[PDB]
Amino acid sequence: APKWPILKNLELLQAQNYSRNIKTFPYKELNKSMYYDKWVCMCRCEDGALHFTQLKDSKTITTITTPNPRTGGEHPAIISRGPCNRLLLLYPGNQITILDSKTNKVLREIEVDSANEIIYMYGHNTEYFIWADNRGTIGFQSYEDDSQYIVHSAKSDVEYSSGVLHKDSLLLALYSPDGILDVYNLSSPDQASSRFPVDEEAKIKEVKFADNGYWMVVECDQTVVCFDLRKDVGTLAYPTYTIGTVTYDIDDSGKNMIAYSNESNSLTIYKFDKKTKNWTKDEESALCLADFTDMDVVCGDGGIAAILKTNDSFNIVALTP
Incomplete structure (x- = not known):
């Protein structure tokens, strides 16, 4: 639960190609201390090998290489980490x-019994993994x-x-760009999903469950809707206010935001202010260097990083004091 340090300087740590169509879910992991770091991950599938570049903060960037198991050398749609390598x-x-x-050994080959495209697959739920259909079939394997x-x-x-799983591991949000956001309870099969209201014209880019356990943050194209899960379905944590030349991302606390602008080529940091109840501009940094259409923020004890993505490449930029 740490407050983000004041940061005016950024440096370029990494530039690489990757495969934007390989959905790599961010895996949680426990420290040699007693908290969880989110690791963010990118996959480059080339020459029949998979190259995974990962980080939890700006201090350590790892890239792991694995062969690609498919004999035709075709790309996996979704990749997710399970226990024990x-x-x-x-x-x-x-x-x-x-x-x-x-x-590098193939352990198992599973054909899931569903006519519908699997749209969510996660492994840190630890004898089972969870998968989900584009029709809302949810299974444990x-x-x-x-x-x-x-x-x-x-x-x-x-x-x-797409889908995202709550930290208590019981709430699964499934969603699509067009506004559908349905939350399922994996503890009771007999319980109907809850439909969350998002206007259809605001394209859903991503859904995160914040660390507090009760904010579901819905990152739309130009705006963010934050739902309070303690209250009646549809209750916002705060009202939606808008702050196509700008991609952004919010950290797991749901109170820090880094926005990138393609006009000025600069990163702006927004904090959600607890008194004023809105996103307020905190710091701005110019980048020295194509258009970044997506980004992810990471931060751990090591320091804050932004992964800035194009359609085929990414840049890892550190945000330093």
């Missing part, structure tokens, strides 16, 4: 290859053996493109 690789046709990232089950069946009237 397990790597979950989702391939078209709902086929999942569990690969050991240290040995064992890494090691056949143990598996379906907590929710496919609906006819939705389409999802």
Whole structure:
């Protein structure tokens, strides 16, 4: 729960190509101390190898290389980490290859039994991984053996493109750009999903569950809607206020924001102010160097980093004192 230090200087740590169509979910991990760091991850699939570049802060950037298990050399749509060097690789046709990232050995090949495209796959839920259909079928599958089950069946009237899981591991938000945001409870199969109201014209880019356990932050194209989960479905934490030349991202606390502008080529930091109840401009930094259409913020004890993404490359920039 630390306040973001005052930061006027940035340096370029990394430039690399990556594969924007390989959905790599950010994996949580516990310190040699007693808290969790979010690791953010990028995958470059080239020459039949997978290259994973990861960081939890600006101090350490790791890149791991793994072969690509598919004989035609086709790209996984979704990649997610499991326990004990397990790597979950989702391939078209709902086929999942569990690969050991240290040995490079293929451990298991699972064909998930669903006519609908798998749209969410996560492994740090730790004998099972969770997967989800674009129709809202949610299932748990064992890494090691056949143990598996379906907590929710496919609906006819939705389409999802992505998902995010709450830290208590019971709330799963499934969503698509067009405004659909449905929250499922994995603890009771018999419980109906909750529909969250997002106007359709505001394109949903991402949904995060904040650290406090009760903010669901919905990052739209030009605006952010933050739902308070303690209250009636639809209750905002604060009102939505808008602050296509600007990508942004919010940290896991849901109170720090870095926005990048493609006109001025600069990073602006916004803090959510607890007195004033809005996002207020805190710091601005000019970058010295194509258009970054996406970004992710990381920060740990090491320091704050922004991963700035194009359609085919990314830049890791540190934000220093």
